A paper describes a structure:
Therefore, the sample was incubated with subtilisin previously to the crystallization step, which accelerated formation of many good quality crystals, under similar conditions and with the same space group. These crystals were cryoprotected into 20% glycerol, and this molecule was found bound at the active site. Interestingly, the last loop is markedly flexible as it is deduced from the fact that it could only be fully traced in the ligand-free crystal, containing only glycerol in the active site, and in the galactose-soaked crystal of the truncated form. Furthermore, the traced loops showed significant conformational changes in the different crystals at Trp-111, coupled to a change in Phe-147 from the adjacent 139–152 loop, reinforcing its intrinsic mobility.
Here, activity screening of a metagenomic library created from rumen fluid led us to the isolation of a novel β-glycosidase, GlyA1, which was assigned to the GH3 family. Structural analysis illustrates the permuted domain composition of GlyA1 that is composed of an N-terminal (α/β)6-sandwich domain, followed by the FnIII domain, and the (α/β)8 barrel domain.
Residue numbers in the entry: 5 to 798
The structure:
C-alpha cells in the first residue's frame, strides 16, 4: 500500500507553474507590494485557460484556480471587487463560448469593451492594473496571423491602451497555450510582461506565487521570438495541407536566427529574467578526445537584492567544414538552486561529442550516413541565453571523427532545395540553396534481407506469459502457442472506452480476446494525455501544466517530481500507458498543438520528455512518446506530406525521440496521422524498424494514432491495412470497436494467406506486445504483486 498525498501532488504541480512562468520585461512594478489593491482587466480572468483544446485538454476537475482567486488566496494583495463585479455582470449577457463539438471552441473569447469611466474609476481605487490576454490552441487547425489569434483583437488593443493611459503601474500576463504577437503589446509598453502559459487546475496558485514575490520567476523561453511571422525560416514552407518541403533543414529556430538573422530576434532562445540579477563567470575547461567528451565549468552569482534561481546554458560552435553548421547548438544546461544575494554556485557539465555531431547525408565528409565531427576548431560558450553566451574554451581536431555509423533511412523521395550556410569574407554567414539528394534505397530488398525467422506454432504448449516473466521459458517458446487468429487479434487495440479496462479511457491492448487472456496476457489500459488523465466517464483527475510550461522550467528534476505523483495516480485508476509526452519540434510558431510540445531545440525537447518519463516510471507506470515523427502542422494532418532531408531528421526531428529512448528509457511510441517523405508513418519500415529498433536499440511497442491511415508506398491509404502496419513493425492498430470480431475488417489474415505478410512479422509484433505487457502494473495485478494506492488529504 502506497499513499498518494494529494496536497503534495498540488505542491509539486504548483512548483512547476512557479518555475515555468517566463518574465520578459519588468521595471520593478513586479513583484506586487504587500497590501496592494489590484485591478484585473480582461474577461478571460473568469475562465482561466488551464490547458489547450483537444485530446490533451479534456481532464475533468472539480475546481480551477484562476489568477484572481490565486491572488486573493495569497493574502499578499486584494482585488478590486467593483471591477470584478462589472466583468461578472457583463459575462451573464456575454457567456464564455465553449463551442459545439470537436475542435469548435474558439481559440479566444470576445473582449469586453471598456470606457474611460470604468478604467478611470478602477485606477482611482487601486495601486496596479493586471491585464490578462487569453489564448488557447489544439488539434486540427493552426493559428492564423490575424486579430483574435496570433495578434491582439481590436478590443484587446483598446483595453491595453486605456489601462496604460490611466494606470502608472501596469502588468500584462499572457495566459496562452503558445506564444502570440508581442509587437503591439511592446509598443503600448506595460511596466511588466510575463508569459504564464496554461498551468492546469492550480495554475492561479503558482502564478500568484511569482506575482507576489513568494517565488522569484526563473522560467526561460524554449523558442526564439522574432519580430514577424515572415522572419521564421519555416514560414515560407508551412501551412500547405498537401505537402511542405522542410527547406530550412537543420536551420530551425535559433539555429537559423543566430547563424543568419540576429537582428530579426526580439527575444532569443533561452531568454528569461528575474527579480534579481546574476553574473555568469566562465571557469575551467578541459577536453578528452579519446572519451569524446569535454568538461566545462562556470560560476553563477546572485548580484542583486533578492533570492532566486538562474539557468547556465552551454552551446557549441562547430567548424563550418564541408557540411555547413549553425553558429551555436545547445549541448547542456543546469538550473541553480535558490541563491541568496551575494551567493554563488559552481556548475560543471560533461558533454558527449554526439550532442554536437552532424549527420552527413551527402558523402562530402567521406562518411555518408554517419554522425561526424568535421576537422576544425570547436568553441564552447556559456551564458544566460544563446545570444548572451560567451567563450568558455575551445579545442581543435586535425581530422574528422565519426561518432556513429548509421544507414540511409527515411530519405526523401523527391528533390528539393534546402538552406546551406555560406561563409563571407567578413566572417558572417549567409543562406545559399543546394539540391537535396533523392533516396536510392531498395525498400523491398531491405525488408526481405532483414526478415525475422518464423517460430513454428505449437497449440499443445500450455506456457503462460507468467512463465516468460519468471525466466522459466524464452518468449519464443511461449509465442508458439498463438494461433493465426490470436496473432491477428493481438495487433488490434480496442477502444475507445473498451469494457476490458477502466471506463472512459483510450484503449485496451494485449489481452483483447478470451484466448489471449487465457494465456495470462493482461488487458493493458491507454489514456490521454500529457497534462493529466482524460476520463470520458466524467471522473476527475489531476490537471497539470501544459507542455511548453514544463519545458520553460529548464528543470528536469521539478518535472520528474510532479510526474512521480502521476505515476501513483495512474495506478489508482488502473491506467498503464499515459499518451505522452507529446514532443514534436516547434518548427513554426503558428502550429496549433505547440502548447503540448516542448521546444524548437532537440536537446531540450528530449531532456524534458525524459524527465516526464522518469517520473512516470517511478512506481512502474509509463508514457508513450508521440507523434513519431514530423507532425509539426495541424492543417491537413490526415494527408499532408512532410518532405525532409535525412540530416534534418537525424539532427532535429528524430533526435528528441532518440534521447527519450536512450536517456528516458522510453518503451512505447505512437506514430502520426500524416506522411513523412511520401508515405504514411504507420507503415514506414525505416522509421519503425531500421531507425527505432535496429539503430537506437528500442525495446518496446509502437502504436498508431487513433484511427490513423496506413498505406504501402504508392498505394491508397486505408484505416484497415494492418498488414502494411505489421510489415513496418508498427505493433498496434489503435483502435477497433471489437478486436476479437475484427470489427475493422482488416487484411492481416488475407495478406498472410496470399504470402504478402509473413507469419514471422506478426510473431515479432506479438512478442513486442507481450514483452511490454508482462512488465506493466496490469500484469502485476494478475500475479497479485501490484501496488495498491490510497489517496489522502482531500
Amino acid at each position: 500500500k502506497v499513499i498518494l498525498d494529494w496536497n503534495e501532488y498540488i505542491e509539486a504541480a504548483r512548483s512547476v507553474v512557479s518555475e515555468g512562468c517566463v518574465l520578459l520585461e519588468n521595471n520593478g512594478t513586479l513583484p506586487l507590494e504587500k497590501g496592494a489593491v489590484v485591478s484585473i482587466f480582461g474577461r478571460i480572468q473568469t475562465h482561466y485557460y488551464k490547458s489547450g483544446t483537444g485530446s490533451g485538454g479534456m481532464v475533468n476537475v472539480t475546481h480551477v484556480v484562476g489568477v484572481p482567486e490565486g491572488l486573493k488566496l495569497s493574502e499578499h494583495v486584494t482585488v478590486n471587487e467593483e471591477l470584478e463585479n462589472i466583468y461578472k455582470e457583463w459575462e451573464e449577457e456575454n457567456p464564455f463560448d465553449e463551442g459545439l463539438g470537436w475542435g469548435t471552441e474558439p481559440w479566444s473569447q470576445p473582449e469586453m469593451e471598456l470606457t474611460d469611466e470604468i478604467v478611470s474609476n478602477a485606477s482611482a481605487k487601486s495601486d496596479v492594473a493586471i491585464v490578462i490576454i487569453g489564448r488557447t490552441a489544439g488539434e486540427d487547425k493552426d493559428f492564423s496571423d490575424v486579430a483574435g489569434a496570433y495578434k491582439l483583437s481590436e478590443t484587446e488593443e483598446d483595453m491595453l491602451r486605456r489601462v496604460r493611459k490611466h494606470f502608472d503601474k501596469m502588468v500584462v500576463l499572457l495566459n496562452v497555450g503558445s506564444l502570440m504577437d508581442l509587437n503591439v503589446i511592446s509598443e503600448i509598453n506595460p511596466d511588466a510582461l510575463m508569459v504564464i502559459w496554461q498551468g492546469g487546475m492550480i495554475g492561479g496558485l503558482g502564478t500568484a506565487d511569482v506575482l507576489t514575490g513568494k517565488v522569484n520567476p526563473s522560467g526561460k523561453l524554449t523558442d526564439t521570438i522574432a519580430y514577424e511571422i515572415n522572419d521564421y525560416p519555416s514560414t515560407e514552407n508551412f501551412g500547405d495541407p498537401v505537402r511542405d518541403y522542410y527547406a530550412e533543414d537543420i536551420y530551425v529556430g535559433y539555429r537559423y536566427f543566430e547563424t543568419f538573422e540576429k537582428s530579426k530576434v526580439r527575444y532569443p532562445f533561452g531568454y528569461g529574467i528575474s527579480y534579481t540579477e546574476f553574473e555568469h563567470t566562465v571557469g575551467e575547461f578541459t577536453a578528452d578526445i579519446n572519451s569524446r567528451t569535454f568538461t566545462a565549468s562556470c560560476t553563477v552569482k546572485n548580484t542583486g537584492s533578492v533570492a532566486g534561481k538562474d539557468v547556465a546554458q552551454f552551446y557549441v560552435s562547430a567548424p563550418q567544414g564541408k557540411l555547413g553548421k549553425p553558429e551555436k547548438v545547445l549541448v547542456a544546461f543546469k538550473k541553480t538552486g535558490i541563491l541568496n544575494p551575494g551567493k554563488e554556485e559552481k556548475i560543471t557539465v560533461t558533454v558527449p561529442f554526439d550532442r554536437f555531431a552532424s549527420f552527413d547525408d551527402t558523402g562530402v565528409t567521406g562518411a555518408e550516413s554517419c554522425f561526424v565531427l568535421e576537422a576544425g576548431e570547436y568553441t564552447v560558450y556559456e551564458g544566460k541565453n544563446v545570444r548572451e553566451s560567451y567563450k568558455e574554451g575551445s579545442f581543435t581536431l586535425e581530422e574528422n571523427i565519426v561518432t556513429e555509423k548509421l544507414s540511409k533511412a527515411l530519405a526523401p523521395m523527391e528533390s528539393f532545395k534546402r538552406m546551406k550556410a555560406s561563409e563571407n569574407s567578413d566572417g558572417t554567414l549567409s543562406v545559399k540553396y543546394e539540391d537535396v539528394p533523392v533516396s536510392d534505397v531498395d525498400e523491398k530488398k531491405r525488408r526481405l534481407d532483414n526478415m525475422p525467422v518464423e517460430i513454428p506454432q505449437d497449440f499443445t504448449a500450455r506456457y503462460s506469459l507468467k512463465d516468460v516473466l519468471s525466466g522459466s521459458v524464452d518468449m519464443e517458446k511461449f509465442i508458439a502457442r498463438l494461433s493465426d487468429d490470436d496473432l491477428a487479434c493481438i495487433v488490434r487495440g480496442e477502444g475507445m472506452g473498451s469494457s476490458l479496462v477502466t471506463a472512459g479511457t483510450a484503449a485496451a491492448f494485449g489481452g483483447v480476446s478470451e484466448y489471449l487472456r487465457k494465456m495470462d496476457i493482461p488487458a493493458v489500459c491507454c489514456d490521454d494525455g500529457p497534462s493529466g488523465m482524460r476520463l470520458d466517464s466524467g471522473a476527475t483527475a489531476f490537471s497539470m501544466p501544459n507542455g511548453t510550461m514544463l519545458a520553460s522550467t529548464f528543470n528536469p528534476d521539478v518535472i520528474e517530481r510532479m510526474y512521480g505523483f502521476t505515476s501513483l495516480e495512474m495506478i489508482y485508476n488502473k491506467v498503464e500507458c499515459l499518451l505522452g509526452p507529446g514532443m514534436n519540434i516547434h518548427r513554426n510558431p503558428l502550429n496549433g498543438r505547440n502548447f503540448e510540445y516542448f521546444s524548437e531545440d532537440p536537446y531540450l525537447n528530449g531532456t524534458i520528455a525524459s524527465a516526464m518519463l522518469k517520473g512516470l516510471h517511478k512506481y512502474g507506470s509509463d508514457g508513450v512518446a508521440k507523434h513519431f515523427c514530423c507532425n509539426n502542422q495541424e492543417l491537413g494532418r490526415q494527408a499532408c506530406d512532410s518532405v525532409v532531408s535525412q540530416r534534418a531528421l537525424r539532427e532535429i526531428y528524430l533526435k528528441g525521440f532518440e534521447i527519450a529512448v536512450k536517456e528516458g528509457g522510453c518503451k512505447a511510441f505512437m506514430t502520426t496521422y500524416a506522411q513523412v517523405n511520401g508515405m504514411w508513418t504507420a507503415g514506414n519500415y525505416d522509421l519503425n524498424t531500421r531507425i527505432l529498433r535496429d539503430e537506437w536499440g528500442f525495446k518496446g511497442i509502437v502504436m498508431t494514432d487513433w484511427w490513423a491511415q496506413v498505406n504501402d508506398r504508392g498505394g491508397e491509404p486505408t484505416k484497415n491495412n494492418t498488414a502494411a502496419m505489421v510489415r513496418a513493425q508498427n505493433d498496434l492498430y489503435m483502435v477497433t470497436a471489437n478486436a476479437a470480431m475484427n470489427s475493422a475488417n482488416d487484411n492481416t489474415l488475407s495478406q498472410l494467406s496470399e504470402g504478402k505478410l509473413n507469419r514471422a512479422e506478426l510473431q515479432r509484433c506479438a512478442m513486442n506486445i507481450c514483452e511490454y505487457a508482462m512488465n506493466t502494473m496490469a500484469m502485476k495485478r494478475l500475479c497479485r504483486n501490484d501496488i495498491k494506492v490510497e489517496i489522502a488529504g482531500r
